[PDB]
């Protein structure tokens, strides 16, 4: 292990409690000490990974299994159809256009021709008439984007260049004259950009200098008459709703704002699903933790009415007006999707299609479309684009495109969902994928994946490297739908957040205990993986129950829960976590904060034969979301407390970091992605002493 300087003078007083930060110097990513740190840890990692002889075998199988063509879900503008495409191993998906659903595709923009496909397309948007394509190019490694606009007729660029855009989409008016977008000044703003003008002419619609940290999303209605501006606060599922009637502007948008403020608080979420003149149908979680659909008239905006009420059990994950006068509701029922087709006017149920284990999504049909497309995926189903023509054949879902994994027989494997009890009795859904008819004899290596926060739902989608693990490592895979997610509505979220963050970790620990006892695996043959808030999950679990795990892999995780709020955009996670600026909330955090809870388990009575599992910490060096100091300071702490602080430490399992050079948190090239996963699976194979097949 390389030497790592400690700074024994850094100490802070959080409400009477002294907390030392000996590795505070790693928070400057540019100091040569930090750069050398990284360089050494890299050196160490490679050294260890050279020992992991299965990496090259995994890598090939992952490549071979990923190498199949992939059509994305098509959407329509005027009489053209756009969609993403990958031949199989292209670094980034290519955006394409066609006149006929089965006519010759044409390439519209190809990210792989730019910086060798380091970044793909994050923001993409086609005008109503299908003549213009506004898309977002990442300039450097940063999150910042430049909006450009191509004519689709000849793939030529307009001179228009819009800088200082991050996550905004580009929302086209139906006159095709311009779009709304949400940039930052050189304090987010809402602007309107006219085609053929300089950005300096763009119209202002909203700012609130008094509330710099409020951010925005926006949208236009299918009839083109109203512009909605949504205002958010942090990552809480809640928002304001302001509406602008475009039909009533003396001089179009060139006048310039007078918004109808239909919702002026952060009490609840609201997403416009459809409207008939001034009569909106919204999706909301107001007095409904699973959501519901409600209807209001803007000309009498005090009076709201249930259209489709809240379900007692199932989450209304999303809703989409289709085929002029119908609704497609996407319900999440015990972590399995269910599609309902209903009448828009009355909200009455017309058809109901439960979906197999897996995930549907990407329903991008609009209200004036009669054919709906969506994507189904699953652990053993790589990707199918289904279509439903609601006009001429409403009952039947037909296959439109279907991915095939080369040399893979899905019938050898199966997927169950079981429910397991957590410490506090709450049942926790988990998926379990393995070979058919294995012995529950405790032998099998076992990978377990989770997240547990921010309302995010973990569906069991397709991973190619998972198959490799399953087939060629005789493995058992488990995805855990622990609390903090949104799987069962907002109470499921809140039951694993702020003061109840600990329930998330107990839920995960409990799933692992089930897997041990049921006979799938054994203590120390269990691997855990998670990224971001899931990395925090991995890191707190190995602090708390190192005895349970053989290997742990924490990707770009949040580890110093005392100081996360101070960097980049960590200040918008205090909704979920808390802030250490408030004593009550500091007392939650200090208990699970991964860097402040690294202890030698062998010094606990009865727990002498125990150590930390083999641990790999993955992060980019230029990660703008979860700043990599988190990952480093933990790595530093773990190495010291467990290894370098002692003459001959019982900690024999390696503790390393795989540091990705010249990459970001976002959008990763296919081969970069494979390189990492191949690394983390070879490591895992060695930590679990698991043989290849």
């Amino acid at each position: 292990y390389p030497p790592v300087r400690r700074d024994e003078t850094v100490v802070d007083d959080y409400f009477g409690v002294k907390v030392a930060d000996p590795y505070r110097w790693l928070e400057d990513p540019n100091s040569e000490e930090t750069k050398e740190f990284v360089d050494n840890q890299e050196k160490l990692a490679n050294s260890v990974l050279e020992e992991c002889e299965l990496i090259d075998k995994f890598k090939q199988k992952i490549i071979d299994f990923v190498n199949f063509p992939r059509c994305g879900v098509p959407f329509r503008r005027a009489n053209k159809y756009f969609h993403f495409y990958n031949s199989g191993l292209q670094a980034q998906n290519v955006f394409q256009m066609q006149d006929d659903l089965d006519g010759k595709p044409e390439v519209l923009y190809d990210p792989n021709l730019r910086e060798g496909g380091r970044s793909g397309l994050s923001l993409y948007s086609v005008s109503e008439d299908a003549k213009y394509f506004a898309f977002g190019i990442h300039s450097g490694l940063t999150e910042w984007v430049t909006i450009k606009i191509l004519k689709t007729e000849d793939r030529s660029y307009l001179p228009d260049t819009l800088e200082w855009v991050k996550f905004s989409p580009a929302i086209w008016t139906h006159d095709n004259k311009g779009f709304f977008y949400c940039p930052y000044p050189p304090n987010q703003e809402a602007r309107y950009h006219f085609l053929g003008t300089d950005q300096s002419e763009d119209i202002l619609l909203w700012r609130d200098l008094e509330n710099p940290a409020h951010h925005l999303k926006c949208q236009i209605t299918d009839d083109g008459k109203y512009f909605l501006l949504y205002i958010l606060d942090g990552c809480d599922d809640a928002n304001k709703v302001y509406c602008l009637d475009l039909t009533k502007l003396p001089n179009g948008l060139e006048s310039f704002a007078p918004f109808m403020k239909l919702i002026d608080s952060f009490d609840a979420s609201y997403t416009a699903i459809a409207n008939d003149g001034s009569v909106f149908t919204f999706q909301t979680n107001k007095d409904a933790p699973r959501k519901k659909l409600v209807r209001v008239d803007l000309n009498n905006p005090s009076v709201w009415t249930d259209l489709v009420p809240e379900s007692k059990k199932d989450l209304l994950e999303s809703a989409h007006a289709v085929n002029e006068n119908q609704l497609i509701l996407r319900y999440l029922s015990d972590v399995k999707h269910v599609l309902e087709i209903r009448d828009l006017e009355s909200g009455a149920l017309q058809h109901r299609l439960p979906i197999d284990i897996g995930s549907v999504d990407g329903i991008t049909a609009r209200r004036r479309d009669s054919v709906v497309f969506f994507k189904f995926t699953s652990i053993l189903t790589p990707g199918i684009v289904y279509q439903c023509d609601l006009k001429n054949d409403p009952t039947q879902l037909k296959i439109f495109r279907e991915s095939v994994v080369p040399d893979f027989d899905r019938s050898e494997f199966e997927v169950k969902q079981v429910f397991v009890p957590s410490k506090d009795g709450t049942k926790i859904p988990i998926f379990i994928a393995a070979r058919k008819g294995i012995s529950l004899d405790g032998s099998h290596p076992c990978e377990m994946h989770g997240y547990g926060g921010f309302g995010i739902n973990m569906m069991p989608t397709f991973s190619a490297s998972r198959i490799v693990f399953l087939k060629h490592l005789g493995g058992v895979f488990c995805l855990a739908n622990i609390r903090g997610g949104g799987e069962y509505g907002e109470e499921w979220h809140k039951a694993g957040f702020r003061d109840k963050k600990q329930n998330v970790f107990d839920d995960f620990i409990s799933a692992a205990e089930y897997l041990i006892s049921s006979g799938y695996t054994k203590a120390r043959r269990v691997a855990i993986e998670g990224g971001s808030n899931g990395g925090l999950l991995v890191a707190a679990c190995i602090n708390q129950r190192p005895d349970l795990f053989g290997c742990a892999e924490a990707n770009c995780g949040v580890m110093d829960m005392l100081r996360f709020h101070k960097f980049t955009l960590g200040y918008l996670w205090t909704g979920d976590y808390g802030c250490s600026d408030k004593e009550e909330e500091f007392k939650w955090l200090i208990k699970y904060s991964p860097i402040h809870n690294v202890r030698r388990p062998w010094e606990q009575p009865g727990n002498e034969e125990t150590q930390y599992p083999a641990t790999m910490i993955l992060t980019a060096d230029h990660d703008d979301r979860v700043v990599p100091l988190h990952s480093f300071k933990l790595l530093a702490t773990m190495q010291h407390v467990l290894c370098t602080s002692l003459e001959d430490s019982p900690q024999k399992n390696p503790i390393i970091a795989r540091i990705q050079r010249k990459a970001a948190h976002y959008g990763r090239a296919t081969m970069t992605q494979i390189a990492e996963v191949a690394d983390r699976y070879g490591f895992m194979a060695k930590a679990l002493e698991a043989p290849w097949i």
């Binding site: 990923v66 994305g72 670094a91 980034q92 995926t377 790589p382 990707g383 959008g667 494979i674």
Partner: peptide
């Protein structure tokens, strides 16, 4: 819009 389902 992730490049591959790895």
């Amino acid at each position: 819009n992730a490049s591959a389902p790895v």
